[PDB]
């Protein structure tokens, strides 16, 4: 069972590396890693389990964050009220197209690997299309908008050694870009 002790902290070199593409099919250990990454998110969203094991309630995890430099991510976003929910383990995900229009969470972002909050807006594409493989090497193409687009972009950033605060404007951290969509979750 993965817990917070498996999550490496900002400053760790692995978080600034470019993660390696996976060869398909995944090895057994790679599948078990990806499943455990998802399971961490599941456990983190269980009030009782999360309390028992001191887990921060998570919606996404990238392999680099558990010190594994491989292009694998898990995303687990519960129903936003509209019946839309996202439960995906992706291999070699790639944003293949996106909107010009930007979107941002009004309170900024945070990260499992960053202990202290950093204030500032993180502008991302409002809409993205991702191609990826699933855990069995089958093809997945996602069209995402708003909150889940933000989450997936945050995760894919980790695969490229990019941290959320890299995007924050130092002079005007809280100034929204023109026509950027404020996203509420
Ligand atoms: C189920 O819990 C929720 C329910 C409703 C809204 C939000 C959440 N959870 C989160 O936002 N969770 C954040 C998160 O998992 N991440 C993922 C991460 O660290 N990815 O690398 C940070 C998010 C900030 C913006 C997108 C990802 C942390 C950093 C605060 C733990
Ligand atoms: Zn993160």
Sign, Cα dihedral of 50, 2, 131, 153: positive
Binding residues for Fe cation are 111, 154, 158
Ligand 1 centroid–CA 47 distance in Å is 15
Fold (topology level) of 1-185: Peptide Deformylase (3.90.45)
55 neighbors 101 (Cβ within 8 angstroms): no
Taking CA atoms only, the protein residue closest to ligand 1 atom 7 is 59
> Which distant-in-sequence residues (6+ apart) come within 8 Å of 117 by Cβ?
108, 110
Documented resolution in Å: 1.9
Sign, Cα dihedral of 144, 146, 150, 153: positive
Closest ligand 1 atom to 58 CA? 15
User: What are 141's two structure tokens?
Assistant: 């193409």
Q: How many CA atoms lie within 13 A of 7 on its CB side?
A: 21
Domain boundaries, the chain: 1-185
Alpha carbon separation from 81 to 48, 88, 107, 185 (Å, rounded): 22, 19, 20, 10
119 neighbors 145 (Cβ within 8 angstroms): no
Q: How was this structure determined?
A: X-ray
Q: Tell me: cis bond preceding 63? Omega within 30 of 0 counts.
A: no
Ligand 2 centroid–CA 163 distance in Å is 7
Q: Give CA torsion, residues 129, 134, 139, 143, to 10 deg.
A: -20
107 neighbors 117 (Cβ within 8 angstroms): no
112 neighbors 166 (Cβ within 8 angstroms): no
Closest ligand 1 atom to 185 CA? 6
132 neighbors 142 (Cβ within 8 angstroms): yes
Task: With CA atoms as reference, report the closest residue to 176 among 129, 113, 130, 126.
Answer: 126
């Amino acid at each position: 069972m993965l817990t917070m002790k498996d999550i490496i902290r900002d400053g760790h070199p692995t978080l600034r590396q470019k993660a390696a593409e996976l060869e398909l099919p995944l090895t057994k250990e790679e599948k078990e890693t990806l499943i455990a990454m998802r399971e961490f998110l599941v456990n983190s969203q269980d009030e009782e389990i999360a309390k028992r094991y001191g887990l921060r309630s998570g919606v996404g995890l990238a392999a680099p964050q558990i010190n594994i430099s491989k292009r694998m991510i898990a995303v687990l976003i519960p129903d936003d009220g509209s019946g839309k929910s996202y439960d995906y383990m992706l291999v070699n995900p790639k944003i293949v197209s996106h909107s010009v229009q930007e979107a941002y969470l009004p309170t900024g972002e945070g990260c499992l690997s960053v202990d202290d909050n950093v204030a500032g807006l993180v502008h991302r594409h409002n809409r993205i299309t991702i191609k990826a493989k699933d855990i069995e090497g089958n093809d997945i193409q996602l069209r995402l908008k708003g909150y889940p687009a933000i989450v997936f972009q945050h995760e894919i950033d980790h695969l490229n050694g990019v941290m959320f605060y890299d995007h924050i404007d130092k002079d005007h951290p809280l100034q929204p870009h023109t026509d950027a969509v404020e996203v509420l979750e």
